[PDB]
Enzyme design. Structure first.
Site, PDB file in Angstrom:
ATOM      1  N   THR A 158       7.671  -1.443  -2.751  1.00 48.30           N
ATOM      2  CA  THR A 158       6.490  -1.149  -3.647  1.00 48.30           C
ATOM      3  C   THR A 158       5.212  -0.596  -2.975  1.00 48.30           C
ATOM      4  OG1 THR A 158       7.194  -2.832  -5.114  1.00 48.30           O
ATOM      5  CG2 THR A 158       4.927  -2.238  -5.351  1.00 48.30           C
ATOM      6  N   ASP A 171       3.599   2.377  -8.107  1.00 49.26           N
ATOM      7  CA  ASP A 171       4.771   3.243  -8.183  1.00 49.26           C
ATOM      8  C   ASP A 171       5.797   2.572  -9.101  1.00 49.26           C
ATOM      9  OD1 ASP A 171       5.672   1.254  -6.149  1.00 49.26           O
ATOM     10  OD2 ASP A 171       7.389   2.612  -5.982  1.00 49.26           O
ATOM     11  N   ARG A 217       9.467   2.397  -8.297  1.00 46.27           N
ATOM     12  CA  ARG A 217      10.758   2.212  -7.629  1.00 46.27           C
ATOM     13  C   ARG A 217      11.066   0.732  -7.442  1.00 46.27           C
ATOM     14  NH1 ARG A 217      12.416   5.547  -2.261  1.00 46.27           N
ATOM     15  NH2 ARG A 217      12.576   7.125  -3.927  1.00 46.27           N
ATOM     16  N   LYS A 223       5.661  -2.122 -12.982  1.00 46.85           N
ATOM     17  CA  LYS A 223       5.081  -3.103 -12.063  1.00 46.85           C
ATOM     18  C   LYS A 223       3.695  -3.575 -12.507  1.00 46.85           C
ATOM     19  CE  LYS A 223       7.579  -0.806  -8.345  1.00 46.85           C
ATOM     20  NZ  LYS A 223       7.647  -0.594  -6.877  1.00 46.85           N
ATOM     21  N   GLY A 266       6.674  -7.403  -3.997  1.00 48.30           N
ATOM     22  CA  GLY A 266       7.471  -8.477  -3.403  1.00 48.30           C
ATOM     23  C   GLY A 266       8.742  -8.738  -4.190  1.00 48.30           C
ATOM     24  N   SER A 315       5.020  -2.507   0.492  1.00 50.36           N
ATOM     25  CA  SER A 315       5.548  -1.823   1.676  1.00 50.36           C
ATOM     26  C   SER A 315       4.793  -0.532   1.986  1.00 50.36           C
ATOM     27  CB  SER A 315       7.039  -1.522   1.502  1.00 50.36           C
ATOM     28  OG  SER A 315       7.273  -0.736   0.346  1.00 50.36           O
ATOM     29  N   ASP A 336       6.430   6.293   2.152  1.00 44.71           N
ATOM     30  CA  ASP A 336       7.135   5.009   2.223  1.00 44.71           C
ATOM     31  C   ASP A 336       8.477   5.105   1.501  1.00 44.71           C
ATOM     32  OD1 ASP A 336       7.581   2.228   2.693  1.00 44.71           O
ATOM     33  OD2 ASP A 336       6.813   1.765   0.690  1.00 44.71           O
ATOM     34  N   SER A 379       8.900   2.999  -1.697  1.00 44.87           N
ATOM     35  CA  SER A 379       8.219   3.433  -2.913  1.00 44.87           C
ATOM     36  C   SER A 379       8.685   4.819  -3.339  1.00 44.87           C
ATOM     37  CB  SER A 379       6.712   3.438  -2.683  1.00 44.87           C
ATOM     38  OG  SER A 379       6.303   2.239  -2.047  1.00 44.87           O
TER      39      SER A 379
END
Ligand SMILES: *[C@@](C)(CO)[C@](*)(O)[C@H](CC(C)C)NC(=O)[C@H](Cc1ccccc1)NC(=O)[C@H](CC(C)C)NC(=O)[C@H](CCc1ccccc1)NC(=O)CN1CCOCC1
Ligand SMILES: *[C@@](C)(CO)[C@](*)(O)[C@H](CC(C)C)NC(=O)[C@H](Cc1ccccc1)NC(=O)[C@H](CC(C)C)NC(=O)[C@H](CCc1ccccc1)NC(=O)CN1CCOCC1
Ligand SMILES: *[C@@](C)(CO)[C@](*)(O)[C@H](CC(C)C)NC(=O)[C@H](Cc1ccccc1)NC(=O)[C@H](CC(C)C)NC(=O)[C@H](CCc1ccccc1)NC(=O)CN1CCOCC1
Ligand SMILES: [Cl-]
Ligand SMILES: [Mg+2]
Ligand SMILES: [Mg+2]
Lengths: 233, 204, 222, 125, 196, 195, 222, 212, 195
Positions: free
Chosen positions: G1, G17, G19, G33, G47, G129, G166, G169
């Site tokens: 994330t 995001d 994903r 999210k 998380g 992340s 990242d 994400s």
């Protein structure tokens, strides 16, 4: 099998239209202790290559000596040592890459991440990475340590692919590098304010800048921040 | 000793034009030893279908548990539970066992009787809802199923075409997994008819 | 403790036709959750109409390719410029890999080219040197996603002739270079969607009797 | 190690050390081998300038290499022991790896190969 | 962290850096480690951010309930409540807290509470990872009954050095002044303190 | 404990269970009956951890006998097997689980059909034509795949079972001291004394 | 994330995001999210996916009951206090990393909560992340006195940095704008810069391709 | 893997599956697990794939060198012992090999040797090797007689692999058959389990556990 | 490998060695001869780690046969046993020791006496009237303590040996598939075919 003792943090770099820029702070950390402050982690080889090194400093100094000795050895029985048979960035890199991989294969690595920035004899920009595992890769922007996580995103906004390189000037490129160094000072706990920056241009050559400082920092908003949730004073 | 890969098995669900499909393999084994080739992993409570992969004892237990709960639901509500509601019930029930979970990969599939909308959903072992327009995969060959579904799938397939797509997704995925296969079942679900087909597949 | 291995991600794919062979691979290079490069090629022309890729740990991958390229060079020196056939290359590579049986090259190797009858050939290797000639092979991070799709679309697995009561199989036939490239592109876009280590760019090396041609396609960069 | 090439070619193309080794054989006591239809017999001369000998313990001229093969010789007695020992070791080694005793041709080929090795190895005669 | 509290003529001053870290990443560069448990009783937090927050919140609750029944609590009482939590839960806490308050009777007082949950009343206290580097400096430079300006300079110079050597310390230098006059917040930025 | 087999044929269920009780380097007993009658037409064989096996078997036996007295009625093999599975499914998440694997052979009098259920210590139930627990299955399943037919008689089933025991006696490492064979059919449960 | 929160003139904006991963596999390409605790208090969660959803719903439920009990609009600090004390009690085992933001009668607020129960205050925050990629952008372009449109741009740019750099994400950018004196506007799929390209081929099978053994009508009715 | 070879009236039958696995990932369904050393010698493969593949083709090279040096085809005993002595040198290093050296010579007749990676070498009439060896044993042993015909022996070998291919999760793909006589080995085809299972089920009436 | 026994009687040494070769859950062979003739009047049985056993036995065999050819003379059982012990004593401090336990049964022609030596993988030699390696000893030693007499005949020794095998077949966990019995006496080495 090693463990790194005295360490250097991020090395960051990028290509621009006529050459490459590379930068690294002047800190030699000893764990959490910010032990040494006059450490130069950018090492020029000739007038066309700069090797930026992060990781173990004792191993960095060993690598310095190898590069120093490489210049000496290349000059032996070589009338064109300062001309056609001078050391190229690609020669210097491949040598280091060979050593790094040989050392990892003997289970006794040089505990480093290395970025070789330079300009080839034909004017082409050279920028390639190698580390303790012998892993190698090239990109328009390259960074080590925290720089990989924080600098690359910022530098990739300027040069996102190959076609963006001719469109990027040395002024814009250096601005992005200097901005990235500030962000790293905000966010990396093993970074220092003082740093060195090197430009290798196919026209103006090697420009090595020492004793640079992070500046134009935003800290004023800190005064408004009180407590950690409720607290009003 | 990895609970999710002792018995083996797979489930996949897909949506089509005014329809849904849910399919599963028939294998139940004990690691290398194949034991049963009749172990179905798809169940239904009214018009809502639930597939469950993972540890076979938990597959059985959860089926019995959701039958239990959907039966009481129907008695009190005086109507059949809908897929969206059942999905929330599955999620609540799994998360209730957050620090001692059922080792399962459930997949809900069905058509809402009021709106007529096709619905599918997937979960991890502790109840996180994974809703999807296209497809849901689960089991020991989930990587294989993800690859098959992502390439083979296209939107708004007719029930007869959707059957071919989901079947080929399952069969070819199963044949690349040692712990999955040994037969397969496919459910084609329309608004007010459901067809159940057993697939011919290699028995190794 | 020092770990001499690493995972550089990416995925590769080899398909063989009647008079050609393709070896495809994405150009993304990663470590953990970071992208190192969006264009780092790992499919190489090794000479003698042999293309090669060693996917997994890039340091071992490059080392292997480098050693095989060198093996081709010395094969010429020692055997009067004789062309190294794909089957001979495959056996040579087995010995390269198995030479490090007790400290392996962490790679899935695939080579592609033409056999001595001019027909398309793909060979694939495990990390320690077991090899097999195949019509079809996916290797690397997204191999488990792509491979079953290839079984279905290249070798027509689980596909029966309509109306024959699942008694007559769909007959095997060679695919055209146009059809193979369609399958390669769809395989990689699908792999890019569902695998985080796959993306950025796709580079295909096509091998015919005329030589080695290249094709490049963009992939999603997220 | 002592490296000298003792066995070497002469202008006329002869290896004198090998040819002088034949003279040592020519000096040695006579040995004869005759093979019949279902047997082989090895005859050996023993010089009679040696009386007061103890024939119980004196090394016999014919030696068993294995239970089915024998070796007699002519020439230097001390040299023969080295060849016999090597031959006996190779006989047991062959039984161990091939699970079958040596053929007479194989055993001969080995002994002959040892002799040849000493004609173009440095530091040996 | 680098934190300290220093008693002086008119009362007491608390001081702290503003760095919060996860490994070598700075999760927060403008943290406030000086927290109010009562009007004129504050604490410096070092160790686990979660643990020290949870403790401070409980102490604030206890002193608020104390005040409702028995009036203003002493600084010693506040330190005792901190101790009780830190000592009884020593197996599950990573908290190094310095308690500092201003009474009118007792004037400025400083109590330090290390990992074990022991209590130590001192003229001044230093704590946190960066404190190691300034034991020598602080011992040589501290004097009792300093003025406000001298104490501010003492804390500023001290934390400046702690920040300079400790990677786990940095950002701004926050300070809180506790006197009969009231409560005053002070902040000092890198451009000032780095070149001291 | 080690070898327990089960074969469902046309009109009966046949259970074979090894007689050996081994501990350390000593065969303590060679006539051990690894089974309990749960009801007149339901038999359960068992294998697994020492102590747990019998303790579990008798606990189930008591419960089924209690039910039979309360309702004056015999539970179906399916009902008994579901009860047993649930007990094991509870057990696996207990402080100390029952490490016991069982076969349940029963004759359903309402359906007039023999039924064989295989349940492991995790609570994994399956209905099968033939079943086995432990290493036995690795030999017997393939053997039965070949030789078994669904319409076999009890006598044909016993010959099929002899073929399994012979194979196990040939290829198994341990001496399991033969088997006790029992038949479950419409007339109840009886033991074959000469095997 | 990748998740972010940015304060502006008359409120606060959060973004994320879309994903959801399962090891290296993208499980959900468009998951939500951004969570609603109360009408004008929203939460971005990184998380363990089940934990972020469960903890946000529990506190959201209790916040509603509290609001009804007190006859008052809920405050962000109440959600913050309830979340942190819950997470602290479970000693980090509930892997919920949250950015809590909203407007209430006290004003506009922006906080972050970590799994072990520690909270932070700021004008700009990032978690997950891809937080380092996002924070790099936030540190480079943030300033005091942002407008609504500037804060949305900065927030989404910070999420994009995570999306592209990242591997954890990807896909789309969700945004929620909480302005004082106005209804909170939830902007689901505010940006969609990762649309799947047209496939090269349709994999619609001829009807009858799959071999069938049995058919039967299933009874769903009573 | 599942591999077997048994001795009988009409020589030696050798049968193997063709699956290759990496954990639960089915890596290949078309692996050649029989190595053709010479016209009279066969080697079977089970365990680590390259360990088997590499060292058994190496064995073939050693056997070729024997007949060049000795002007005579190597014995099955000697060929098996070269391999067993080789792996014994590597004992403890972690080689994983379960092999069977099958062949005919004049002095020996039809002979089978089991050779594995911990140095075990055994002459015998019947062996099954691999993860599905027990499944193969169950069918093979219960139907084996010395007086089997070449036709029946070939089928039993095929049927035994099929049995293991079905039950063992790490066996499958197809069955490769070989028949070894005094005249040498004879290949008896590749038989895909996909078709073979249903063909055997229908014709034989077996596999009643499966949904027909 | 598992069971190797030895009994020295008046005029001979009798060695009994189990026929089973087991690996995993499969008995691969039931006719394995776990012995090698070192010389015409000396026999060595062996048990232990797979591969090591035969490799060691044959290595010793080759060495003794080499000696016999060189000297045209048969080494005494005592001399052979000392040679074997020293090899194992070297082996135990090697990089990879031979994990092989042996019994050496021989008839000394000069003394006209049978001799039985027990040597373990450590190089621990003892001369005994009766010996065993592995778990066998735990049953056979006490049995022989009771029934053995030093003046027994070869036939009495075989009956005594049958008594051991019966006890092992009764109380041992594993199926060792019977034994191959060999007799060493003044006339050399011969095998008993019906045991
Ligand atoms: C200086 C830095 C050290 O003395 C100061 O004391 C400050 C105190 C202020 C902030 C009140 N301390 C910290 O910043 C503190 C350092 C620390 C870390 C771990 C244990 C004790 C002290 N940092 C934290 O508490 C951070 C705050 C988060 C990032 C907002 N928390 C963590 O790093 C947590 C700690 C969990 C924990 C461990 C042991 C005891 C109690 C709590 N860890 C993680 O989030 C896990 N992290 C995941 C990524 O991989 C690295 C570990
Ligand atoms: C970015 C992607 C990473 O930081 C974001 O933080 C997102 C947050 C969004 C989705 C709310 N995080 C994830 O996507 C998250 C990453 C992750 C994975 C594992 C542990 C922690 C974080 N993914 C998940 O939480 C997935 C949710 C998907 C949709 C199913 N869950 C899993 O992967 C679960 C982990 C559950 C868990 C249990 C106990 C402790 C920690 C986590 N894992 C599995 O389902 C794996 N396995 C499947 C086969 O059956 C056995 C379980
Ligand atoms: C039956 C089918 C199962 O055992 C047979 O025994 C066959 C024998 C045939 C193929 C000769 N055995 C296997 O298929 C064998 C099983 C096995 C695996 C590992 C150790 C022992 C036995 N499989 C292999 O050897 C496979 C070969 C195929 C081509 C993949 N190889 C691997 O698994 C390799 C190498 C394993 C290895 C052995 C010794 C040293 C180092 C490694 N490993 C991988 O490819 C790793 N893996 C692949 C997936 O991507 C992640 C990395
Ligand atoms: Cl804090
Ligand atoms: Mg199988
Ligand atoms: Mg990304």
């Amino acid at each position: 099998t090693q463990q790194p003792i005295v360490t250097g943090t991020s090395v960051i770099s990028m290509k621009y239209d006529n050459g490459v820029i590379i930068a690294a702070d002047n800190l030699g950390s000893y764990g959490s202790l910010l032990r040494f402050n006059g450490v130069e982690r950018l090492i020029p080889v000739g007038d066309n290559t700069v090797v930026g090194i992060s990781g173990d400093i004792s191993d960095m100094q060993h690598i310095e000596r190898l590069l120093k000795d490489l210049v000496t050895e290349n000059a032996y029985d070589n009338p064109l040592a300062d001309a056609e048979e001078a050391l190229e960035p690609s020669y210097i890199f491949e040598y280091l890459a060979t050593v790094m991989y040989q050392r990892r294969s003997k289970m006794n690595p040089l505990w480093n991440a290395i970025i070789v920035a330079g300009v080839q004899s034909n004017g082409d920009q050279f920028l390639r990475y190698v580390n303790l595992l012998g892993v190698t890769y090239s990109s328009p922007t390259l960074a080590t340590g925290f720089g990989a996580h924080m600098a690359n995103p910022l530098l990739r906004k300027v040069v996102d692919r190959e076609s963006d390189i001719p469109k990027t000037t040395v002024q814009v490129a250096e601005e992005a590098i200097v901005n990235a160094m500030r962000v790293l000072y905000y966010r990396d706990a093993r970074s220092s304010r003082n740093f060195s920056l090197a430009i290798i241009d196919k026209n103006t050559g090697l420009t090595f800048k020492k004793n640079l400082q992070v500046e134009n920092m935003k800290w004023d908003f800190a005064k408004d921040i009180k407590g950690y949730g409720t607290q009003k004073i | 000793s990895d609970p999710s890969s002792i018995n083996g098995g797979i489930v996949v669900a897909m949506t089509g034009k005014d329809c849904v499909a849910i399919a599963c393999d028939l294998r139940l084994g004990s690691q290398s030893l194949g034991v049963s080739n009749k172990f179905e992993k798809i169940f239904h409570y009214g018009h809502v279908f639930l597939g469950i992969t993972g540890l076979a004892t938990d597959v059985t237990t959860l089926n019995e548990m959701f039958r239990y709960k959907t039966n009481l639901y129907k008695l009190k509500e005086e109507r059949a539970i809908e897929p969206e509601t059942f999905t929330q019930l599955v999620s609540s029930s799994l998360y209730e066992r957050r620090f001692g979970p059922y080792f399962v990969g459930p997949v809900v599939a069905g058509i809402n009787s009021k709106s007529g909308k096709p619905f599918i959903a997937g979960f991890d072992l502790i109840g996180c809802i994974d809703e999807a327009k296209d497809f849901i995969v689960s089991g020991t060959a989930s990587d294989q199923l993800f690859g098959m579904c992502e390439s083979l799938y296209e939107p708004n397939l007719e029930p007869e075409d959707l059957f071919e797509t989901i079947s080929q997704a399952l069969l070819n995925a199963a044949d690349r997994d040692a712990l999955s296969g040994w037969g397969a079942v496919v459910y084609i679900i329309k608004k007010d008819e459901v067809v159940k087909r057993y697939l011919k597949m290699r028995q190794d | 403790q020092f770990n001499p291995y690493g995972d550089n991600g990416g995925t590769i794919l080899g398909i063989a036709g009647e008079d050609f062979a393709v070896l495809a691979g994405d150009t993304r290079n990663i470590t953990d959750y970071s992208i190192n490069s969006r264009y780092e090629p790992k499919v190489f022309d090794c000479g003698d109409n042999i293309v090669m890729s060693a996917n997994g740990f890039a340091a071992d991958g490059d080392a292997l390719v480098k050693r095989f390229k060198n093996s081709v060079k010395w094969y010429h020196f020692d055997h009067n410029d004789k062309k190294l056939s794909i089957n001979s290359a495959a056996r040579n590579i087995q010995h390269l890999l198995y030479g490090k049986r007790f400290f392996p090259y962490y790679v899935h190797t695939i080579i592609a080219g033409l056999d001595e009858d001019g027909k398309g050939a793909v060979y694939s290797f495990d990390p320690v040197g077991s090899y097999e000639r195949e019509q079809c092979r996916a290797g690397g991070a997204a191999a488990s996603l792509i491979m079953p799709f290839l079984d279905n679309q290249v070798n027509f697995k689980n596909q029966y002739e309509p109306g024959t009561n699942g008694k007559v199989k769909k007959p095997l036939k060679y695919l055209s270079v146009e059809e193979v490239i369609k399958l390669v592109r769809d395989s990689f876009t699908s792999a890019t969607e569902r695998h985080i280590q796959v993306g950025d760019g796709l580079e295909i090396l096509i091998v015919t009797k005329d030589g080695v041609r290249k094709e490049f396609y963009e992939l999603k960069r997220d | 190690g002592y490296d000298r090439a003792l066995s070497i070619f002469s202008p006329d193309g002869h290896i004198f050390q090998v040819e002088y080794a034949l003279e040592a054989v020519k000096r040695g006591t006579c040995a004869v081998g005759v093979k019949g239809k279902n047997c082989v017999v090895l005859g050996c001369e023993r010089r009679s300038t040696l009386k007061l000998q103890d024939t119980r313990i004196t090394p016999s001229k014919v030696s068993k290499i294995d239970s089915h093969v024998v070796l007699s010789f002519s020439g230097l007695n001390a040299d023969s022991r080295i060849l016999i020992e090597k031959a006996r070791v190779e006989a047991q080694s062959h039984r161990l790896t091939l699970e079958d005793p040596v053929t007479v041709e194989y055993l001969t080929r080995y002994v002959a190969g040892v002799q040849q090795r000493y004609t173009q190895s440095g530091g040996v005669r | 962290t680098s934190i300290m509290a220093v008693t002086f003529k008119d009362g007491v001053i608390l001081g702290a850096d503003s760095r919060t870290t996860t490994g070598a990443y700075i999760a927060n560069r403008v943290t406030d480690k000086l927290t109010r448990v009562h009007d004129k009783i504050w604490c410096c937090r070092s160790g686990s951010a979660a643990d020290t927050q949870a403790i401070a919140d409980i102490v604030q609750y206890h002193l608020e309930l104390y005040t409702s029944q028995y009036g203003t609590p002493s600084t010693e009482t506040a330190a005792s409540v901190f101790k009780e939590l830190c000592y009884e839960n020593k197996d599950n806490l990573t908290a190094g807290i310095i308690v500092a308050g201003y009474d009118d009777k007792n004037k400025g007082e400083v109590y330090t509470i290390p990992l074990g949950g022991s209590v130590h009343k001192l003229p001044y206290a230093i704590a946190g990872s960066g404190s190691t580097f300034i034991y020598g400096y602080c011992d040589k430079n501290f004097r009792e009954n300093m003025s406000k300006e001298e104490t501010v300079d003492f804390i500023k110079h001290s934390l400046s050095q702690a920040i300079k050597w400790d990677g786990s310390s940095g950002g701004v230098i926050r300070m809180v002044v506790l006197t009969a006059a009231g409560v005053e917040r002070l902040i000092f930025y890198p451009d000032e303190y780095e070149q001291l | 404990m080690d070898i327990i087999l089960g074969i469902r044929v046309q009109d009966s269920v046949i259970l074979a269970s090894s007689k050996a009780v081994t501990r350390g380097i000593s065969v303590l007993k060679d006539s051990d009956d690894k089974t309990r009658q749960l009801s007149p037409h339901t038999l359960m064989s068992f294998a697994g951890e020492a102590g747990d096996t019998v303790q579990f078997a008798e606990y189930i036996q008591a419960n089924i006998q209690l039910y039979s007295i309360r309702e004056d009625y015999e539970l179906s093999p399916q009902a008994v097997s579901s009860f047993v599975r649930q007990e094991l499914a509870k057990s696996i998440r207990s402080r100390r689980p029952y490490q016991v694997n069982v076969l349940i052979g029963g004759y359903d009098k309402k359906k007039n059909k023999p039924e064989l259920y295989q349940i492991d210590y995790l609570g994994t139930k399956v209905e099968l034509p033939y079943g086995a627990h432990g290493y036995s299955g690795f030999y017997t399943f393939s053997l039965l795949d070949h030789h078994y037919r669904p319409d076999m008689t009890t006598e044909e089933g016993l010959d099929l079972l002899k073929l399994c025991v012979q194979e196990l006696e040939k290829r198994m490492p341990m001496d399991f001291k033969g088997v006790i064979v029992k038949i479950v059919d419409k007339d109840g449960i009886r033991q074959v004394d000469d095997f | 994330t990748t998740i972010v929160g940015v304060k502006f003139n008359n409120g606060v904006v959060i973004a994320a995001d879309t994903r959801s991963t399962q090891g290296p596999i993208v499980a959900d390409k468009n998951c939500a999210k951004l969570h609603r605790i109360s009408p004008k208090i929203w939460c971005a969660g990184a998380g363990t996916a089940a934990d972020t959803e469960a903890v946000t719903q529990l506190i959201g439920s209790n916040i509603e009951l509290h609001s009804l009990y007190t006859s008052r609009e809920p405050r962000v600090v109440s959600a913050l206090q309830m979340l942190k004390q819950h997470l602290f009690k479970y000693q980090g085992h509930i892997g919920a990393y949250l950015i809590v933001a909203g407007v209430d009668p006290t004003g506009s607020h922006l906080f972050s909560i970590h799994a072990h129960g520690s909270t932070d205050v700021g004008y700009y925050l990032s978690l997950g992340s891809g937080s380092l990629a996002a924070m790099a952008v936030l540190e480079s372009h943030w300033k005091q006195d942002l407008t609504k449109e500037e804060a949305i741009k900065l927030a989404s740019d910070a999420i994009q940095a995570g999306i592209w750099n990242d591997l954890g994400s990807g896909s789309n950018v969700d945004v929620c704008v909480m302005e004082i004196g106005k209804d909170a506007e939830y902007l689901r799929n505010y940006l969609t810069p990762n649309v799947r390209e047209e496939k090269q081929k349709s994999y619609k099978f001829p009807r009858g391709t799959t071999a069938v053994l049995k058919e039967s009508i299933v009874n769903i009715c009573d | 893997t599942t591999t077997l070879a048994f001795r009988f009236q009409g020589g030696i039958i050798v049968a193997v599956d063709s699956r290759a696995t990496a954990g639960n990932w089915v890596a290949s369904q078309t692996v050649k697990k029989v190595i053709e050393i010479n016209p009279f010698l066969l080697g079977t493969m089970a365990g680590g794939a390259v360990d088997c593949q590499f060292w058994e083709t190496w064995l073939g090279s050693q056997c070729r060198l024997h007949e060049l040096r000795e002007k005579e085809r190597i014995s099955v005993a000697a060929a098996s012992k070269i391999l067993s002595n080789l792996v014994y040198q590597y004992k403890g290093a972690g080689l994983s090999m379960g092999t069977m050296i099958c062949g005919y010579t004049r002095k020996e007749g039809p002979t089978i040797y089991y050779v594995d990676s911990d140095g075990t070498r055994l002459k015998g009439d019947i062996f099954c090797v691999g993860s599905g060896q027990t499944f193969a044993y169950g069918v093979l042993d219960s139907n084996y007689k010395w007086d089997l015909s070449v036709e029946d022996a070939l089928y039993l070998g095929k049927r035994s692999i099929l049995a293991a291919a079905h039950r063992d999760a790490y066996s499958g793909g197809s069955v490769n058959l070989y028949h070894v006589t005094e005249d040498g080995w004879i290949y008896h085809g590749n038989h895909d389990v996909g078709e073979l299972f249903w063909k055997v089920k229908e014709e034989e009436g077996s596999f009643n556990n499966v949904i027909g």
